[PDB]
Design a protein around this ligand. Structure first.
Ligand SMILES: CCN(CC)C1CCN(Cc2cc(I)cc(I)c2O)CC1
Ligand SMILES: [Zn+2]
Length: 197
């Protein structure tokens, strides 16, 4: 099975937002709107914003899952490589196999799907802090795109779904991810390639 990646705002007008972090060689996480692609360093904080037009019901949750982007790989489960799944860098909550973690949220839950075997991490949907207009979730990606025996240079997408308390679909958005040593340079390069192409 391949989970849908269709953008769907749904009844609550759900969509993601990203900061404008620039492309300096020192930057650790940066988003390209032109590529709809997040570039980040291994295990570093990735702020992702949640925006809605109206308040969803109590019990609404927000799930993140990775899938391979390319058609010939979309069916393979995205997981950490044989090295990283064994490096004992657990935060006490995330299974060591999971590529995507949520940072600093005690209510995060990690799912190994009993049928598809796909991994995901889900948290309660919460209102913005007083004074803010959106809610931010901090994600970590725990392997490099290049990890041998894992992603092995294959591009992935992160799919973010807004769910009701049963896990039914309320909204969906997605973005490509590259986990790399120099996100600033790589974003600049890929945006240049795009502009040329
Ligand atoms: C312009 C948008 N207006 C409506 C007029 C409001 C602003 C206030 N929010 C509250 C709210 C609750 C949850 I739980 C999650 C999120 I993210 C969130 O924004 C709801 C939308
Ligand atoms: Zn790895």
């Amino acid at each position: 099975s391949v989970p849908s990646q269709k953008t769907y705002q749904g009844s609550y007008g759900f969509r993601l937002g990203f900061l404008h972090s620039g492309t300096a060689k020192s930057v650790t996480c940066t988003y390209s709107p032109a590529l709809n692609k997040l570039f980040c360093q291994l295990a570093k904080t990735c702020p992702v914003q949640l925006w809605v037009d109206s308040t969803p019901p109590p019990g609404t949750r927000v799930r993140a899952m990775a899938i391979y982007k390319q058609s010939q790989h979309m069916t393979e489960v995205v997981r950490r490589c044989p090295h990283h799944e064994r490096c004992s860098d657990s935060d006490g909550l995330a299974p060591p196999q999971h590529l995507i973690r949520v940072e600093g949220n005690l209510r995060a839950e990690y799912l190994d799907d009993r049928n598809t075997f796909r991994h995901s991490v889900v948290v309660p949907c919460e209102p913005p802090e007083v004074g803010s207009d959106c809610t931010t979730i901090h994600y970590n990606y725990m392997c490099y795109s290049s990890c041998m025996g894992g992603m092995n240079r294959r591009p992935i997408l992160t799919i973010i779904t807004l769910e009701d308390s049963s896990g039914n679909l309320l909204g969906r958005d997605s973005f490509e991810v590259r986990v790399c040593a120099c996100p600033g340079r790589d974003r600049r390069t890929e945006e240049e390639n795009l502009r040329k192409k």
